Amino acid sequence: MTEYKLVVVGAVGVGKSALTIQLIQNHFVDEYDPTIEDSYRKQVVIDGETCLLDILDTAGQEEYSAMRDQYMRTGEGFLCVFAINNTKSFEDIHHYREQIKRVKDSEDVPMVLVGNKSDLPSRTVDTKQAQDLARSYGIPFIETSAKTRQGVDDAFYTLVREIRKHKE
Amino acid sequence: MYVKLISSDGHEFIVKREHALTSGTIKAMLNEVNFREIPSHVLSKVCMYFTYKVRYTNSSTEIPEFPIAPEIALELLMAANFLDC
Amino acid sequence: RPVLRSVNSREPSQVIFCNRSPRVVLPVWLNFDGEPQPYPTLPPGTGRRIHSYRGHLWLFRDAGTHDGLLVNQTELFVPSLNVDGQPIFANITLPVYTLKERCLQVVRSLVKPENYRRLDIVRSLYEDLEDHPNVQKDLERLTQERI
Amino acid sequence: MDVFLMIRRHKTTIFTDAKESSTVFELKRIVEGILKRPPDEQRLYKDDQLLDDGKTLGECGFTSQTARPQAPATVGLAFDTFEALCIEPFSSPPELPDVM
Ligand SMILES: Nc1nc2c(ncn2[C@@H]2O[C@H](COP(=O)(O)OP(=O)(O)O)[C@@H](O)[C@H]2O)c(=O)[nH]1
Ligand SMILES: [Mg+2]
């Protein structure tokens, strides 16, 4: 069975952990330890194909060492995720993207932009600019929210789709 | 000012002295110098390289590649090593 | 400690890597300890908008052979300060190789190392054949030339 | 615009440059200074074509694209009466060795 190794990146407090758990344990987690980084495996079906997802939920302080570089280098696809309530996350998306391109040694790395917390009424960045930036990157944008869980599976499965397109 | 460069097969190549001075070994041999180990098809390439070097040294824009045919590669290499250029 | 190192400036600088060479260009960034770090390659004739930081040291080589290349008619490249948000341009070009080095390049592309010494040339050229371009050796040379 | 040429006669080859605007007569003067023959006793050729010492080099077909330093375009030279344009050829490289 074909495996897909997914890596979720973003600033601390964007919702990476809660979103990741929402993909697997099917429950929104209101508060998760900011320091806990772990991987999770889940057997799923995408377009009929029985895929195995391996999701690394990144967390912790910056580490631009050889070891962290190689750890992230094993990622086949990346979820650059931001929160619509935090401007800094949408600004940081670019830095995370450049780091991915460095460790993957390519300008074309499978990834999907995510606008999380689409249940919060406050909007610092609307759904419109994110699609513009993704267009500048050449990736899809999904406005999923882990709290309401709308579009989370769409995001992960779209990353698997982008990976499949890159492998073909 | 010009210098004559005679090849092993008797070909006379007249180049500007400033350009032939690119070769350290030629600059050491100093207005007519004979080479008994370098054929005409090699000395012609060496002279072309002299003009190429003088034209593009300290140029501000892009530089074209110096073309070297595989069949001449070895002989040109030996000539370059001996001429110190 | 090494003289040829990048500065931990943490100030963004947008740079344009322009490959105006026939070769496949490997960008090499000198980290804060001076060690060369290869970056993604540029196909010939390609321009790419990269993001670096002020005071960072860059050099450019042939991706396949590590042959030396020039950037803005010099060996090393350091981004300046971006005036009004415009990008700095890094023009990567060929240098005027010595005829000996150019011939050594082409012979290296034809013969395999296993057969290098089976060529009817002076023995002095055999070691020169196996002495492939080295980023570290050029860094040593450049450092002493600054001194 | 500079054009880089090797003007040849018999076993002699003169490497020099000129302007694309430079006329055939000025090049004949250049060869007078080197081979000691005035633009009277000499006739320049592009391929088998005789060049009229009044037209510019670029007007004869000598462009920067076709007359580079690393690949100069050839201009034949012939000297009572003139001689048949004779350019003795260069040597030939050997058969390419097995290892290449
Ligand atoms: N309203 C809302 N809150 C969210 C959403 N996703 C995450 N959060 C909250 O944001 C906080 C930080 O998210 P967290 O999972 O710890 O992200 P991480 O630490 O970067 O991996 C958590 O307490 C979540 O309750 C969402 O879609 N909507
Ligand atoms: Mg976390």
Author numbering:
A (entry chain D): 1 to 168
B (entry chain B): 17 to 46, 58 to 112
C (entry chain C): 60 to 206
D (entry chain A): 1 to 79, 83 to 103
From the paper:
Leveraging established cocrystallization protocols, , we crystallized ternary complexes of VCB-PROTAC-KRAS with KRASG12V-GDP and KRASG12R-GCP as representations of KRAS­(off) and -(on). We obtained suitable cocrystal ternary complex structures of 1 with KRASG12R(GCP)-VCB and 3 with both KRASG12V(GDP)-VCB and KRASG12R(GCP)-VCB at resolutions of 2.83, 2.63, and 2.89 Å, respectively. Analysis of the ternary complex structures of 1 and 3 with both KRASG12R(GCP) and KRASG12V(GDP) showed that the same relative orientation as previously solved cocrystal structures was adopted, regardless of the mutation or nucleotide. The main observed difference was the loss of interaction between 3 and Tyr112 of VHL, relative to that of PROTAC 1. Chemically, 3 differs from 1 only at the point of attachment to the VHL binder, where it presents a cyclopropyl 1,3-dicarbonyl in place of the isoxazole of 1. This modification alters the interaction potential between the PROTAC and Tyr112 of VHL, which may partially explain the shorter ternary half-life observed for 3 in KRASG12V-GDP + VCB (3 = 70 s and 1 = 228 s). However, there were no significant differences observed at the KRAS–VHL binding interface to explain the observed difference in the ternary kinetic stability between the two compounds. As expected, differences in the Switch II loop are observed between the G12V­(GDP) and G12R­(GCP) variants for each compound. Interestingly, for 3, very small differences are also observed in the base-binding loop regions between the two differentially loaded mutants.
Kirsten rat sarcoma viral oncogene homologue (KRAS), a key component of the pathway, is the most commonly mutated oncogene and is a key driver of tumor growth in several human cancers. Here, we address this gap through the development of heterobifunctional VHL-based PROTACs capable of engaging and degrading KRAS­(on), thus addressing a wider range of KRAS mutations.
